[PDB]
Design a binder for these strands. Structure first.
Length: 103
RNA sequence: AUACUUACCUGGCAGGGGAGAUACCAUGAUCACGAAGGUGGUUUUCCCAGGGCGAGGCUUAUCCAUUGCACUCCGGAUGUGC
């Protein structure tokens, strides 16, 4: 990602203040990274003592999409950002086996 | 209702008798006439599995016939289960 897209330029700093956002822009405009980046900053800067939890307590974040097709787009991009950072992403969507999903 | 599209939930794999035997047919088998066999038929014997046909018999009631002398069951009809 060589340069921030417009939505990224403005939404990222608002997200870094923990503020809610309504972003008006269409898919293809770099929305996904705009919301992913403040989340990754937050997660990876928690103290290790605080990133510690022994029981599984579900996700730090949920990203809801209207369609399976859009959800998968988001997933692919989330993986490519999250893996290098040791951040795990799971897709709960239709068109996939419930065994695989359940697992 | 039907067809497709997207999203969500779901998601094991594999099959269709078996085992013998076949002298005969095909496979016209690459070494001086030939393989054996295997494979595919055919026929047949086992292990047998599900159907078809229902002769005969068992059981019980309505109607009909019967007043009959036997000691070899045993008139007709119709219907539920066997």
């Amino acid at each position: 990602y060589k340069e921030p897209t417009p939505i990224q330029r403005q939404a990222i700093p608002i997200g870094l203040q923990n503020r809610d956002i309504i972003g008006v822009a269409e898919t293809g405009s770099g929305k996904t990274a705009a919301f992913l980046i403040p989340l990754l900053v937050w997660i990876t800067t928690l103290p290790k003592i605080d990133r510690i939890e022994e029981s599984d307590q579900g996700p730090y974040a949920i990203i809801l999409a209207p369609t399976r097709e859009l959800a998968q787009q988001i997933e692919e991009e989330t993986i490519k950002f999250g893996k290098p950072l040791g951040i795990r992403t799971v897709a709960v969507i239709g068109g996939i086996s419930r065994e695989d999903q359940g697992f």
